[PDB]
């Protein structure tokens, strides 16, 4: 639907080694396609989906150069953050960034973002206008002033409106056989014993792509979400995803309950039940 290109950066201090480790990953929608790890010997941007391997050497060389530079900048940032917060070198800290573009229906930028966290807490963020920053505390206000002085916001807006969208369009065509195929869940309901006046029905959805799905239980069309167990959607290992929803029902009354599945890979919602 609204396709996206997103990158995720993690930098972590390692007191034991007196250095840090920078790891980046890139995704198109829910498919990881690149990684970088500064710990690798001769660290390079590396393919993680088969369709990105049709990029030539200019692409791998230039992406690698960007990450080596960025990885350096984040090592310095870790030191700076340590100072802002009056922290010693004894403990590990984490500096994260994420940015990306959401492609509208018209192939236009729907929403571009860029934000940062420190030790798991929101630190600073580019506002929706792509023109100004919101800083989370006193330390982040120093950063905000630095980045206003150097007009960083114009650099981010340029990227998110220009190369982010342009490259996403290329990836989507390059990998169209997978990134643009909606793979529908394989669904079924299982039955299991339980407790006093208790039998569990589990509605499975296996092998679907993309990750967004709706699984719910109903009795006579009345939603049972209050008493059901819904696990977080989880990766299959093969690029697809898995999820299930389970409910305890009275013994003998299995046929009163129906599991309802919505997924963009199905022409119409599914209704299924214990059989």
């Amino acid at each position: 639907g609204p396709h996206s290109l997103s990158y995720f950066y993690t930098a972590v201090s390692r007191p034991d080694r007196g250095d840090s480790r920078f790891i980046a990953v890139g995704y198109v929608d829910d498919t990881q396609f690149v990684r970088f790890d500064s710990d690798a010997p001769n660290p390079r941007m590396e393919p993680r989906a088969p369709w990105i391997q049709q990029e030539g050497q200019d692409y791998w060389d230039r992406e690698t150069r960007k990450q080596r530079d960025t990885s350096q900048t984040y090592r310095v940032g870790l030191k700076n953050l340590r100072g802002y917060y009056n922290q010693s070198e004894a403990g590990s800290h984490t500096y994260q960034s994420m940015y990306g573009c959401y492609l509208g229906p018209d192939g236009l930028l729907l929403r571009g973002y860029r934000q940062y966290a420190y030790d798991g807490a929101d630190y600073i963020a580019l506002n929706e206008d792509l023109r100004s920053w919101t800083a989370a505390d006193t330390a982040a206000q120093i950063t905000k002033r630095k980045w206003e002085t150097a007009n960083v916001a114009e650099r981010r807006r340029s990227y998110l409106q220009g190369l982010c969208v342009e490259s996403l369009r290329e990836y989507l065509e390059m990998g169209k056989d997978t990134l643009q195929r909606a793979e529908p869940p394989k669904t079924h309901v299982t039955r299991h014993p339980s407790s006093d006046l208790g039998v569990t029905l589990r509605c499975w959805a296996l092998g679907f792509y993309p990750k967004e799905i709706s699984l719910t239980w109903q009795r006579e069309g009345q939603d049972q979400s209050q008493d059901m167990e819904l696990v977080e959607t989880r990766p299959s290992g093969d690029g697809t995803f898995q999820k299930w929803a389970a409910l305890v029902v009275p013994p003998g009354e299995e046929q009163s309950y129906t599991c309802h599945v919505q997924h963009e890979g199905l022409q119409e919602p599914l209704t299924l039940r214990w059989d």
Partner: peptide
């Protein structure tokens, strides 16, 4: 494609 610009925190 990555955003090439880096800015110190």
């Amino acid at each position: 494609s990555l955003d090439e610009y880096s800015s110190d925190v």
